[PDB]
Amino acid sequence: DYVPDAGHLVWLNFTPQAGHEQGGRRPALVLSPAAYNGVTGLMQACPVTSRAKGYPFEVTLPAHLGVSGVVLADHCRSLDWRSRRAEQLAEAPADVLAEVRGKLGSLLGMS
Amino acid sequence: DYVPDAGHLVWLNFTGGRRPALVLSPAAYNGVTGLMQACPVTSRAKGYPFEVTLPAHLGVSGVVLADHCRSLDWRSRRAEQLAEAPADVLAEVRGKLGSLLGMS
């Protein structure tokens, strides 16, 4: 009954093609609304990486949120959250969301 | 030495298999990162609210799926320019994708 909504941080699965690579899961910041997500089974989401290097599209998460690491605003991508067995983990302050959207909007050449 | 630029329609490998896509990110970012933000083009098109129709005789036919935009490594996928989108298609795709991602 869980449907991801804008601002949710979700666990998402990934499985390499080659059965010999490991595959695992990774948290992602959801950008698209529940209306779209719940219906289509897809979402626009940015990955969270534990390797913060000071890359200018990295957006930091608050230290007590219970998700460590950094959102890569420019790595936004359409993912199927049902097949990837999305699990809610936390809710990103609309703070973090607004910074991700401004950086990504700039890259996409938004009006 | 091709670098994809905003508005370009490109071929991208399945990596046997090439598919068309509309680039949204500019060449200065694309060249430096080896990544780009692009929406896939399909011939499989009618009604869907995030589809943007490509005008006839552009060199590829069908729609842009604005909601299926993604970061991808274009260098690995051997990007080759297919055409250039009219400024109206590019603005329409950015409008729908902007709405979906919750921008203003």
């Binding site: 998402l12 699965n13 990934f14 499985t15 390499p16 093609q17 690579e21 595959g23 990774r26 289509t40 089974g41 897809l42 990955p47 990486t49 390797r51 290097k53 000071g54 890359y55 200018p56 599209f57 890569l72 790595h75 991508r77 359409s78 993912l79 199927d80 049902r82 097949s83 990837r84 401004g102 950086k103 909007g105 700039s106 890259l107 | 598919r19 500019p26 200065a28 970012y29 430096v32 990162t33 990544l35 896939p40 399909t42 799926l65 299926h68 993604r70 970061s71 991808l72 490594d73 690995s76």
Partner: peptide
């Protein structure tokens, strides 16, 4: 945000490779 501003601070050391989401899943187009 100004893209030239963000471009200025990218370096070979801070560059991230394409995020590995493995194979296509479910309804993903690509």
């Amino acid at each position: 945000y100004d893209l030239a501003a963000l471009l200025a601070e990218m370096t070979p050391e801070n560059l991230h490779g394409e995020t590995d989401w493995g194979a296509l899943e479910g309804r993903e187009e690509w």
